[PDB]
Each structure stands twice: as C-alpha cells, then as structure tokens.
C-alpha cells in the first residue's frame, strides 16, 4: 500500500535532482525499486492512519536524503532537493571491519557506506543480509549495484531495533514509549530521536547542529509535499545520545 500513499510523481518531486548535475547515482534509485523493497518490510508506510503513513515515508526519505545529499546552501531549488545524489561512501579510511565471530569480515571486502542509509560495518551488513536472504558479508557491493537490495538495506535499518535504541519505525508510528533513562536523557518521541538513532553520537545533545538542521530541512519539505503535519520534537539538540 505504500504506492497508494506516495505516487511516482510525488517520489520524483521529493527526490527532485537525484538524476541531475554531477550526482553519482543517476538512474539508480528508482520508484519501482523503492516500492518493491517496501513490500518486503511489512508495516513500513502501512501502519496507522494515512497521516502516520505519510510521516513515516517523509521521515524515511528525509534521513536517507541527508546521508546521500549533494545539496548546498545555494543549490538550484534549495539544498533540500538534492538527496539521493550518492550511493557509495567517498574516501573511506578503512574497511569498516570490526572483528566478529558472528559477522566475520570477508578478505579484501570493505563495509564503507552504501545505499540510502549509507549502511556501514560488517556487524550491520551481516544481519541485514540475513534478513534480506543474501550474503552481504561476502558481497557488500551488491548494496551499490542492485537498486532493490540498496533500498532493502535502508528499510531493514529503519525497521530494526538495536538496543538500547528502538526502531525508527516504532518511534514514527507512535509505538515507542521512552524508558526512565530515556526521559532523564531528554529523549522524547519525534523526528529528533530518529536522528539520535542514526547519528546521535556526533550530532545530538550539544545545541544547534547544521547536520541535524539539514535532516529537518528535508523532512519539512517532504511533509509539505505530502501534505502532512510535522509532529512534535523535531530536533535532538537537547537529547543525550543513546547508551
């Protein structure tokens, strides 16, 4: 049902310039691929009222747009029209291998960021590949070469709790309730705690941050396009990182 809520026209209006300029992933991120991936993750964009469903797709596309953004302050149509410009991390310093019995690194393979959520590390490629049905420890580049696997890895990340963190899905559909430690930390439901889930260690809890604002910039633009309210608690400037 996610295609009922977001049309191809809408999708393209939000992801306006992905196939433009000097973007590195032109033609790669397709509506059809997005919609097929969404189907594998039951509940995504189909949980709650029509308004909750829109917020979820907006929030999803907004977090992933930041991770892949080719935007700048004076970019054509604004900085928030240039998400999904990249599919691979540019100039990683390492293979992102952190030695693991559970998720062992494959020799000569690298787990730098790929796809919509710029998935990183063996200990994320491992689980994600298990969920999707395919070996991403041995072939992590699949995340950069198959448009449907790419989206599937981002939605796996969206739909999956990694304690003490809840899933981004649970938060945006209003299913998450903060613990006592969460409330001590100032973590309250909303878009801002999803930013905390994604990259809170660097971005959250220390006042106004340009990266956090960029995520919110995409979110508001997409919410506007889908015609839905933003909901509360958009930033994480006053939230301690998870731990």
Please give the full DSSP string across 39-62, using - where no structure is assigned.
Answer: HHSTTTTTSSSHHHHHHHHHHHHH
Q: Does 67 participate in catalysis according to the annotation?
A: yes
**In whole angstroms, what is the distance from residue 154 CA to residue 98 CA?**
21
Whether 141 and 220 share a structural domain = no
Cβ-based burial of 30 (10 A; exposed 0-12, middle 13-18, buried ≥19): middle
Whether 180 and 65 share a structural domain = yes
Given 145, 178, 213, which residue is the final one in a domain? 145
The answer to whether 124 and 142 have CB atoms below 8 angstroms apart is no
Whether 141 and 216 share a structural domain = no
Whether 106 and 192 share a structural domain = no
Output the CA angle 226-231-232, nearest 5 degrees: 155
Given 145, 170, 192, which residue is the final one in a domain? 145
Whether 16 and 128 share a structural domain = no
Whether 4 and 79 share a structural domain = yes
Q: Domain tally for the chain? A: 2
Phi, psi torsion values for 78, nearest 5 degrees: 95, 160
**In whole angstroms, what is the distance from residue 177 CA to residue 83 CA?**
30
Whether 81 and 123 share a structural domain = no
- The tokens for 23 are 């973007």
Tell me which method was used to determine the 3D structure: X-ray
CA 171 from centre of chain: 14
**In whole angstroms, what is the distance from residue 80 CA to residue 71 CA?**
7
Whether 102 and 192 share a structural domain = no
Whether 155 and 223 share a structural domain = yes
DSSP-based three-state secondary structure for 103: coil
Catalytic pick among 56, 67, 89, 203: 67
Whether 206 and 119 share a structural domain = no
DSSP-based three-state secondary structure for 106: coil
Long-range contacts of 130-137 (CB under 8 A, 24+ apart): 131/156, 131/160, 132/40, 132/156, 137/103, 137/104, 137/105, 137/106, 137/109
Given 119, 145, 171, which residue is the final one in a domain? 145
Whether 38 and 156 share a structural domain = yes
**In whole angstroms, what is the distance from residue 235 CA to residue 187 CA?**
10
Q: Could you list the residue range(s) of the whole structural domain that residue 152 is in?
A: 1-87+146-243
The answer to whether 158 and 165 have CB atoms below 8 angstroms apart is no
Whether 229 and 165 share a structural domain = yes
What does the DSSP 8-state code read for residue 104? P
């Amino acid at each position: 049902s996610v295609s009922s809520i977001v049309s191809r026209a809408q999708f393209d209006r939000m992801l306006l310039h992905r196939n433009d300029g000097a973007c590195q992933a032109k033609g790669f991120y397709t509506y059809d691929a997005f919609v097929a991936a969404a189907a594998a993750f039951s509940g995504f964009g189909t949980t709650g009222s029509a308004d909750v469903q829109k917020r979820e797709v907006a929030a999803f596309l907004a977090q992933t747009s930041h991770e892949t953004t080719g935007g700048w302050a004076t970019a054509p149509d604004g900085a928030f029209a240039w998400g999904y410009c990249f599919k691979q991390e540019r100039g990683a310093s390492s293979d992102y291998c952190t030695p693991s019995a559970q998720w062992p690194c494959a020799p000569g393979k690298r787990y730098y960021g790929r796809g919509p959520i710029q998935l990183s590390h063996n200990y994320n490629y491992g689980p994600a590949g298990r969920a999707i049905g395919v070996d991403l420890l041995a072939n992590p580049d699949l995340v950069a070469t198959d448009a449907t696997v790419s989206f599937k890895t981002a939605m796996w990340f969206w739909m999956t709790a990694q304690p003490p963190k809840p899933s981004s899905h649970a938060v945006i559909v209003g299913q998450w309730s903060p613990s006592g430690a969460d409330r001590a930390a100032g973590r309250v439901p909303g878009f801002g705690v999803i930013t905390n889930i994604i990259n809170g260690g660097i971005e959250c809890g220390h006042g106004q941050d340009s990266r956090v604002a960029d995520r919110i910039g995409f979110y508001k633009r997409y919410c506007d396009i889908l015609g839905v309210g933003y909901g509360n608690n958009l930033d994480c400037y006053s939230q301690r990182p998870f731990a």
